[PDB]
Design a protein around this ligand. Structure first.
Ligand SMILES: C=C(C)[C@H]1CN[C@H](C(=O)O)[C@H]1CC(=O)O
Ligand SMILES: C=C(C)[C@H]1CN[C@H](C(=O)O)[C@H]1CC(=O)O
Ligand SMILES: [Cl-]
Ligand SMILES: [Cl-]
Ligand SMILES: [Cl-]
Ligand SMILES: [Cl-]
Ligand SMILES: [Rb+]
Ligand SMILES: [Rb+]
Ligand SMILES: [Rb+]
Ligand SMILES: [Rb+]
Ligand SMILES: [Rb+]
Ligand SMILES: [Rb+]
Lengths: 254, 254
């Protein structure tokens, strides 16, 4: 009846609220994922306790196949749900359950406006403009695993020189795009958020692939199917679209 | 044991193959969904028999609350899987299990080229151009249930005059668009297929909602999650993308 929820700070999904005094408990947070959790809890009738994931990671596997991050929290039954922009992937689905997606997206490219670059193949065929992705995220894993020649070429480039083209987190990637001649391979929903707020950046090309974010649960959880039904309800009533517009829309671009 | 797969003829998902002699068994069929089934068969290691759904319906509930179509075939355990452009909806997910989506799409508008109509609100604020949907499909249901004012208005129009603006199937809708002053509310992936083949037709506006097609299984089926993992594998390898290109590409229209 009180669910323990693992999450991670990531704009505009989960952010610290602004207050004149110190904040405690669920009141520390706002964002799209908090709104989602409120809606799910209303539909399904549960209380919840939001806990930042202690290692600050989403969930990836090492060499020994051991997991970290929110994925490992679910595997170890230290949380009932993970509510975050947690990409639904083949490797994660083998070890946890996800609801159906509450948002659909794809990898694309964040770069500057008004350049000759139109596609990933435009990046793949040159070496002057650097490009990469968040290290150990689902986008990086996409490239590492791809057998498409263009994407193999890109992976060879990203992984060269001790992964100097990769970044630790999205904000580092964004600053690298704004300052240097660098393109970031980034989930398209994050790109939309960014380009609403940085009028000199743009998405280049379309989506390279198609995937979703889902609510994570331990394998076998009874909540996964209940949360899926609740998500479908919210989408069909237009609520998920309204929640996206609320958190994404910026102050406009000239 | 060989799995029974329920499906329905719908271009370019499931179509009768062309041959000079009578065809039998799985050899009767080709199309995107047959390709998908072959790939799922090869990942998961099952044999399968494809069976057309006897009532030729996808799955809707009547006034008594009784289901029909492929949804009912699963409910009654007369099929193990349904592989078709079967829309993942709140009402259906209550009664069957769907894999995660193999295709994402949304409702949009099919109409003639060259007109000043640009959106669903352009339709809704007028009476001269007729518009509708396939009766008892998930698109009609979206309009029937919507509490958004524009879609409420459009539903009043569609349901008027004993639903004369509605059509029994997509081909009837397409011919009505081609011949009369009529717009069809249709799933975007089917709009994409139709406009690559009839050059006088176009999509009007973008996608009014977001949803997916998934493989249906009876509640409780062990195949549901195994099929989800296989779909994620196929997506991440670029196979689903290649299969869509194979079946959608038209070579005749500007
Ligand atoms: C914000 C980041 C590190 C997360 C968000 N979804 C992806 C994941 O769930 O792995 C990561 C982004 C990416 O890999 O581009
Ligand atoms: C071809 C039709 C009758 C199917 C395809 N998906 C929807 C379904 O699964 O309900 C229907 C289309 C629609 O309602 O626009
Ligand atoms: Cl915390
Ligand atoms: Cl699922
Ligand atoms: Cl033949
Ligand atoms: Cl048959
Ligand atoms: Rb403060
Ligand atoms: Rb799973
Ligand atoms: Rb290759
Ligand atoms: Rb700059
Ligand atoms: Rb279900
Ligand atoms: Rb138009």
């Amino acid at each position: 009846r009180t669910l323990i929820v693992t999450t991670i700070l990531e704009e505009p999904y989960v952010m610290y609220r602004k207050s004149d005094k110190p904040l405690y408990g669920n009141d520390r947070f706002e964002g799209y994922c908090l709104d989602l959790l409120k809606e799910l809890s209303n539909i399904l009738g549960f209380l919840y306790d939001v806990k930042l994931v202690p290692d600050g990671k989403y969930g990836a596997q090492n060499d020994k196949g051991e997991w970290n991050g929110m994925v490992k929290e679910l595997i170890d039954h230290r949380a009932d749900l993970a509510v975050a922009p947690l990409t639904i992937t083949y490797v994660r689905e083998k070890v946890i359950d996800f609801s159906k997606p509450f948002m659909t997206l794809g990898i694309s490219i964040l770069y500057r406006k008004g350049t000759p670059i139109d596609s990933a193949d435009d990046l793949a065929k040159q070496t002057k403009i650097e490009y990469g992705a968040v290290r150990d995220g689902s986008t990086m894993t996409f490239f590492k695993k791809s057998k498409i020649s263009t994407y193999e070429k890109m992976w060879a480039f990203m992984s060269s020189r001790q992964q100097s083209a990769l970044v630790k987190n999205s904000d580092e990637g964004i600053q690298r795009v704004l300052t240097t001649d660098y393109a970031l391979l980034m989930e398209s929903t994050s790109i939309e958020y960014v380009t609403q707020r940085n009028c000199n950046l743009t998405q280049i090309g379309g989506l390279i692939d198609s995937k979703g974010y889902g609510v994570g649960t331990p394998i076998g959880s009874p909540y996964r199917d209940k949360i899926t039904i609740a998500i479908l309800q919210l989408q069909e009533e237009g609520k998920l679209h309204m929640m996206k517009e609320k958190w994404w829309r910026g102050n406009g671009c000239p």
